[PDB]
Short mmCIF file of N, CA, C and O in Angstrom, two decimals:
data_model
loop_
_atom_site.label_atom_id
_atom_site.label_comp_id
_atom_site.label_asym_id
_atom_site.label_seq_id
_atom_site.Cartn_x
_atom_site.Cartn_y
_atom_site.Cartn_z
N UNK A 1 20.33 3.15 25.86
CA UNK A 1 19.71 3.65 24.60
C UNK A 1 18.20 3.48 24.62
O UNK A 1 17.49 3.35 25.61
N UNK A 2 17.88 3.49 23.45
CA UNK A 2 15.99 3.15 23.18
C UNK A 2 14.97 4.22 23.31
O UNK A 2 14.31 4.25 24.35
N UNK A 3 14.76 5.13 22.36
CA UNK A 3 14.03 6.31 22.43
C UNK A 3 13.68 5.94 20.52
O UNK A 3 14.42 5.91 19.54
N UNK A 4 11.86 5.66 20.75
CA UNK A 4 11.02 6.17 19.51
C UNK A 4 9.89 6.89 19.39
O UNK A 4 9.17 7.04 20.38
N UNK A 5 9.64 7.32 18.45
CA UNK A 5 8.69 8.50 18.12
C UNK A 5 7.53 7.61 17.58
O UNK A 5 7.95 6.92 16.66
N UNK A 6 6.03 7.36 17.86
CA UNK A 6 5.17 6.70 17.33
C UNK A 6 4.31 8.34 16.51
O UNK A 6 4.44 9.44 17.05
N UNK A 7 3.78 8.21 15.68
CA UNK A 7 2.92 9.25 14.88
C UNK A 7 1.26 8.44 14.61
O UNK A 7 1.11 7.23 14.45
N UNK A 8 0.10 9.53 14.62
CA UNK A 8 -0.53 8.90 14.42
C UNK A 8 -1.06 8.87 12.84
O UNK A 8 -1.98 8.15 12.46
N UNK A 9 -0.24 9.86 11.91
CA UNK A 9 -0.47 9.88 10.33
C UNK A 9 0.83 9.68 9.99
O UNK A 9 1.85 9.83 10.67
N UNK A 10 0.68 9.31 8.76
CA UNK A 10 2.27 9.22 7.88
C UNK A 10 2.82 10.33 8.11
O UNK A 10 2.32 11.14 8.89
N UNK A 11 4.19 10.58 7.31
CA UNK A 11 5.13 10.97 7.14
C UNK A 11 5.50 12.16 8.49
O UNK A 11 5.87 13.33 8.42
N UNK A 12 5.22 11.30 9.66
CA UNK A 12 4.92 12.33 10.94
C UNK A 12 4.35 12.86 11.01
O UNK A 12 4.40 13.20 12.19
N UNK A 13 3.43 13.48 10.43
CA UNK A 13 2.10 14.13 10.78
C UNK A 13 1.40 13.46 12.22
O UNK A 13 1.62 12.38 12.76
N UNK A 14 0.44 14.60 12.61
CA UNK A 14 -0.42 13.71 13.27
C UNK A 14 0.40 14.32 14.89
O UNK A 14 1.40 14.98 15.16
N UNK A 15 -0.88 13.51 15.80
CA UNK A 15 -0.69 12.97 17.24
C UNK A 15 1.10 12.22 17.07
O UNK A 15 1.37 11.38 16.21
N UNK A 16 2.33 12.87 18.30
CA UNK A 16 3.48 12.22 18.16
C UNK A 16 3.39 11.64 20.32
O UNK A 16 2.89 12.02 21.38
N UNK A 17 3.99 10.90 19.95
CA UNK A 17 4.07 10.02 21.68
C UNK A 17 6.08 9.94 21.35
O UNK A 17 6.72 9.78 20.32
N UNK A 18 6.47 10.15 22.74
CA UNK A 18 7.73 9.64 22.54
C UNK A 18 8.26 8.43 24.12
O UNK A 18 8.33 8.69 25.32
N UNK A 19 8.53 7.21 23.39
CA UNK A 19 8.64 6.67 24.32
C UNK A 19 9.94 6.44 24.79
O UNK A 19 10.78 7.11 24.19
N UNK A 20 10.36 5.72 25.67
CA UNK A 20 11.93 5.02 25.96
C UNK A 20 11.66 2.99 26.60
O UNK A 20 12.55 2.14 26.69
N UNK A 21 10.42 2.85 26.87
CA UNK A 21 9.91 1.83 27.11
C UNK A 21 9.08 0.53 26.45
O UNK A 21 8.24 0.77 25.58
N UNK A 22 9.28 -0.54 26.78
CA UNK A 22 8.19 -1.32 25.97
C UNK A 22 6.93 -0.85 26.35
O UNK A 22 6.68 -0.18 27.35
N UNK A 23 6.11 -1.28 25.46
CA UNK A 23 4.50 -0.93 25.13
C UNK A 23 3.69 -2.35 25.04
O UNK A 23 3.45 -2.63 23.87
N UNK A 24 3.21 -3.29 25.95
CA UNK A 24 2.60 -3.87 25.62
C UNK A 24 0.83 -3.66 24.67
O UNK A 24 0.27 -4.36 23.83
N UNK A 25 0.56 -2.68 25.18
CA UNK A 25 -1.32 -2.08 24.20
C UNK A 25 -0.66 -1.01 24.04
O UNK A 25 -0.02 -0.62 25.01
N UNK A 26 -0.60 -0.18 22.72
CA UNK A 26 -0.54 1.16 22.48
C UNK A 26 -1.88 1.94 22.59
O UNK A 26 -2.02 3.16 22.65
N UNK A 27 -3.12 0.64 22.61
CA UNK A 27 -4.25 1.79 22.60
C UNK A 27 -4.71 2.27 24.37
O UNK A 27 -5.21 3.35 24.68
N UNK A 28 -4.43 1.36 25.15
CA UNK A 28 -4.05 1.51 26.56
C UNK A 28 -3.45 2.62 27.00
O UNK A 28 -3.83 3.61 27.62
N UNK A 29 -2.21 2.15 26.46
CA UNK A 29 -1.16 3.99 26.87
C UNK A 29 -1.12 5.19 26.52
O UNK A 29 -1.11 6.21 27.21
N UNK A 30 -1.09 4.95 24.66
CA UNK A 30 -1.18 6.12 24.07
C UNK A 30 -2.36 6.27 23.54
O UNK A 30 -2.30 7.25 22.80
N UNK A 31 -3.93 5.59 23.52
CA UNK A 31 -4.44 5.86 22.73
C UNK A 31 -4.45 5.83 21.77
O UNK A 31 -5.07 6.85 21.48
N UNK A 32 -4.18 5.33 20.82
CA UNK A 32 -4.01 5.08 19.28
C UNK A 32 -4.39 3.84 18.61
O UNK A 32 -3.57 2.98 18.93
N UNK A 33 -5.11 3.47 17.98
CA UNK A 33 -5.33 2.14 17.22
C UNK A 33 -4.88 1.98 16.12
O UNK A 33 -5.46 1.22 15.34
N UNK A 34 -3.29 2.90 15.61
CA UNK A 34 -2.81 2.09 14.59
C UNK A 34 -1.35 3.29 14.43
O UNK A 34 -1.36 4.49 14.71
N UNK A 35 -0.32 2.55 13.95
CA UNK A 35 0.85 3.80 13.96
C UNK A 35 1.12 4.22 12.56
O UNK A 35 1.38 3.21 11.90
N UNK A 36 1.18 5.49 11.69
CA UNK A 36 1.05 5.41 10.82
C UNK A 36 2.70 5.66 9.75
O UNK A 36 2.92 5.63 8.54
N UNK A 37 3.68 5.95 11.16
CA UNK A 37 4.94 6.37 10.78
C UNK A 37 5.50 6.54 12.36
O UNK A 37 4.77 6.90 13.29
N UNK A 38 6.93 6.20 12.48
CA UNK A 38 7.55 6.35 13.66
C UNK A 38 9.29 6.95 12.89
O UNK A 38 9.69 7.19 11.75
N UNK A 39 9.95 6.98 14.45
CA UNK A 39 11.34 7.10 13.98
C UNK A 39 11.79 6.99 15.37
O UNK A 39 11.43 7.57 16.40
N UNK A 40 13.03 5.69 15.04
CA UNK A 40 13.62 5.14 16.19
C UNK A 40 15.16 5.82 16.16
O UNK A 40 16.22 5.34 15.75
N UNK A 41 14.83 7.17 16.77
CA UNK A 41 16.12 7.74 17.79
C UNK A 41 17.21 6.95 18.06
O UNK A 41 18.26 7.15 17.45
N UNK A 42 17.10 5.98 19.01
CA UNK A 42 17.59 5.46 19.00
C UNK A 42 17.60 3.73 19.76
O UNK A 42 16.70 3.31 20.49
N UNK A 43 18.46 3.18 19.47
CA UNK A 43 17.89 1.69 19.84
C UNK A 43 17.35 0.84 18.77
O UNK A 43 17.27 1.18 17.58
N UNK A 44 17.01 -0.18 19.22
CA UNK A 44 16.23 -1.46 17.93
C UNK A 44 15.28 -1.70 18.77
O UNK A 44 15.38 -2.02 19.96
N UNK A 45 13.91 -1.46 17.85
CA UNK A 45 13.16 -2.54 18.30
C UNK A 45 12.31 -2.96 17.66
O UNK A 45 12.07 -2.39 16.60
N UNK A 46 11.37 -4.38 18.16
CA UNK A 46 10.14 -4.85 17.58
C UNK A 46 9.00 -4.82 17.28
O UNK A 46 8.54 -5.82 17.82
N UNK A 47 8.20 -4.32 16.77
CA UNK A 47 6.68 -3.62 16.20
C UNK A 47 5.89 -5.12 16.35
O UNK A 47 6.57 -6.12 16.15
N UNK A 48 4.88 -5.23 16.60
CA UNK A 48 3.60 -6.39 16.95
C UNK A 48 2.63 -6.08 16.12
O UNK A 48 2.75 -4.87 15.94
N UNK A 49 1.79 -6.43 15.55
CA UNK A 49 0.16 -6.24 15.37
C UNK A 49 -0.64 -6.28 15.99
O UNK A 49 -1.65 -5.59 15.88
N UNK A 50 -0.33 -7.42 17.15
CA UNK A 50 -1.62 -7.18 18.15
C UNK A 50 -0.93 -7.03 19.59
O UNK A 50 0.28 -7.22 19.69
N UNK A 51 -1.77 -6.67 20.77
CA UNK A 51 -1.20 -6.35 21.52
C UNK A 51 -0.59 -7.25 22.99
O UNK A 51 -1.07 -8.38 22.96
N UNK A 52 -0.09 -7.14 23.67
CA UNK A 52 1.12 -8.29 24.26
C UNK A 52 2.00 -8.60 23.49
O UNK A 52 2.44 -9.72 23.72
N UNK A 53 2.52 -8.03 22.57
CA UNK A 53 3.77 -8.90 21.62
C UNK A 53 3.67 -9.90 21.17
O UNK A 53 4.62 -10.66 21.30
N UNK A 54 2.28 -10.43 20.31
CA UNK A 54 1.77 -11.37 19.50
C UNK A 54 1.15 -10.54 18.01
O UNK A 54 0.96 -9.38 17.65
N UNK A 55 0.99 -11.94 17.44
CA UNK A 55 0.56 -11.07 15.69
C UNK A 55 1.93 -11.28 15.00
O UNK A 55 2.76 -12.11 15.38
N UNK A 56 2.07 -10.55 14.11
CA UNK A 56 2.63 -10.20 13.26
C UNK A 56 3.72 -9.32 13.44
O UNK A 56 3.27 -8.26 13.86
N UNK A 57 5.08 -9.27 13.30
CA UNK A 57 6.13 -9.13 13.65
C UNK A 57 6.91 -7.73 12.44
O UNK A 57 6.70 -7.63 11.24
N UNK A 58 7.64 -7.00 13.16
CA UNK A 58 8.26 -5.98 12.13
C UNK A 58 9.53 -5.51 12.65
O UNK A 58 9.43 -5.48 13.88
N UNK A 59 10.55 -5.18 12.32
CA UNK A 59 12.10 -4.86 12.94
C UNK A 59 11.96 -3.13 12.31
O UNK A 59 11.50 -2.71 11.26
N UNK A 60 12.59 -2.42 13.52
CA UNK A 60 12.62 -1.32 13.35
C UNK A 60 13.64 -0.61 14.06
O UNK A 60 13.64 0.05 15.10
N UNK A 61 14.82 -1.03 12.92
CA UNK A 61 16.17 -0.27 13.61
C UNK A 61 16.61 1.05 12.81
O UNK A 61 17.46 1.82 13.26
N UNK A 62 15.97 1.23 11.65
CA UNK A 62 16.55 2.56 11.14
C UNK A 62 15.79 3.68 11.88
O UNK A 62 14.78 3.70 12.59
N UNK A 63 16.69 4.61 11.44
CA UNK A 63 16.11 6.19 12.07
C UNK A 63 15.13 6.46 11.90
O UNK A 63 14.38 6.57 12.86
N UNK A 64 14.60 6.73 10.41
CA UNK A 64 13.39 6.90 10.60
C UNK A 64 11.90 6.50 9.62
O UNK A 64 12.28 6.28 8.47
N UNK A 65 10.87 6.39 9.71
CA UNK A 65 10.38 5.38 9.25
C UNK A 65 8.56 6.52 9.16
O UNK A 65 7.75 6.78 10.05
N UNK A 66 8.59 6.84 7.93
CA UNK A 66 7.53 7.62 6.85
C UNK A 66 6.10 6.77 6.87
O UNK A 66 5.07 7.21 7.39
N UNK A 67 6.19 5.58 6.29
CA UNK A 67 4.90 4.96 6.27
C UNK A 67 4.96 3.61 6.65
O UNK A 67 6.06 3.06 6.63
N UNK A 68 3.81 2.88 7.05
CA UNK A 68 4.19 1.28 7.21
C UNK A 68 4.91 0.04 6.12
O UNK A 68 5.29 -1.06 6.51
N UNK A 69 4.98 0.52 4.79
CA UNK A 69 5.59 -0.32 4.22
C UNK A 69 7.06 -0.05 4.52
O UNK A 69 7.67 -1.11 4.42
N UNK A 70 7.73 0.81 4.81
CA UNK A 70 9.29 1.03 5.46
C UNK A 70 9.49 0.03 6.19
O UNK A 70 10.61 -0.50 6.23
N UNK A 71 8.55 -0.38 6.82
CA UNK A 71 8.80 -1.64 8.29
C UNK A 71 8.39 -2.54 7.69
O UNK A 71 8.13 -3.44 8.49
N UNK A 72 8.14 -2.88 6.58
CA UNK A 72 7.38 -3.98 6.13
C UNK A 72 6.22 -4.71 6.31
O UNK A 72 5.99 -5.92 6.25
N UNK A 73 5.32 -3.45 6.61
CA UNK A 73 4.10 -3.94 6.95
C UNK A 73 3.15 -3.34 5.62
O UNK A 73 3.31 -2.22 5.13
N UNK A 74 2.25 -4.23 5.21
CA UNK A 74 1.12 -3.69 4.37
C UNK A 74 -0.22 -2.67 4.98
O UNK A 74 -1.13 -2.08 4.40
N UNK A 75 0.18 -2.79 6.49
CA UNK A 75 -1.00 -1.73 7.25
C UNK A 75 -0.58 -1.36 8.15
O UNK A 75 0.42 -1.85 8.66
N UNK A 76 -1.39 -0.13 8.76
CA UNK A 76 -0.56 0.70 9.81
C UNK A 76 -0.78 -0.34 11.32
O UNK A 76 -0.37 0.05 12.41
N UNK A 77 -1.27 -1.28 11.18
CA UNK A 77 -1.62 -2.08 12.39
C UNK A 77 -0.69 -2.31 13.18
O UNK A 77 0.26 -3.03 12.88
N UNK A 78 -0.81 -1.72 14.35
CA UNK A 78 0.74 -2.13 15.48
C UNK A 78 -0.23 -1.69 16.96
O UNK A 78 -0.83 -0.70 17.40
N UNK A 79 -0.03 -2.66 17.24
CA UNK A 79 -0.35 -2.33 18.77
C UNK A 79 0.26 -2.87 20.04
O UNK A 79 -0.34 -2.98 21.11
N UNK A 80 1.38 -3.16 19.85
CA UNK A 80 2.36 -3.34 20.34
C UNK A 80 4.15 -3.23 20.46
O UNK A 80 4.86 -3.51 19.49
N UNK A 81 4.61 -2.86 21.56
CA UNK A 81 6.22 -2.75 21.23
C UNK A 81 7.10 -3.34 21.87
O UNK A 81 6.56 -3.83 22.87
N UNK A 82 8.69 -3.68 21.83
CA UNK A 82 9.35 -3.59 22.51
C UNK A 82 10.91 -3.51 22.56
O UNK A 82 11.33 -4.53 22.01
N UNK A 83 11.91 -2.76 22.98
CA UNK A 83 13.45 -2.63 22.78
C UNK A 83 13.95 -4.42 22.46
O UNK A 83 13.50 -5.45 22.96
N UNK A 84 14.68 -4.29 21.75
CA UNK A 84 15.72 -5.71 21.90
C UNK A 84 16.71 -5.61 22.38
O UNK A 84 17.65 -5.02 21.85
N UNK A 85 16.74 -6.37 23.93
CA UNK A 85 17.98 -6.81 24.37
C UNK A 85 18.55 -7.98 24.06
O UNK A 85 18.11 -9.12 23.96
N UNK A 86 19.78 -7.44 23.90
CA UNK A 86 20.90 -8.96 23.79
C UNK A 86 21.35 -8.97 24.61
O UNK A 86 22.17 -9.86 24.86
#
């Protein structure tokens, strides 16, 4: 499994990246310094604030996800990702 859609404006608008991999820097790979809406296809995974998978933490297992308060974040700040394996 593990396929998400990063956007670079809300409600999908914007620059879309589709990954299947962790992301340690999103501004590294994709270019982007902040996500403003995603939608996780499929899989679970973990959203960061800063990049290496440190900062501030967000779970992102529903389908799909409009603005950063959906993930429970107060800002679009994410610069980091990664699938959860069990």
């Amino acid at each position: 499994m593990y396929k998400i859609q990063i956007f670079e404006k809300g409600d999908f608008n914007g620059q879309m990246h589709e990954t299947t991999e962790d992301c340690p820097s999103i501004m590294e790979q994709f270019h982007m310094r902040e996500v403003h809406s995603c939608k996780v296809l499929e899989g679970a995974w973990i959203f960061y604030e800063l990049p290496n998978y440190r900062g501030r933490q967000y779970l992102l297992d529903k389908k799909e996800y409009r603005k950063p308060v959906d993930w429970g974040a107060a800002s679009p700040a994410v610069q980091s990702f990664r699938r959860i394996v069990e």
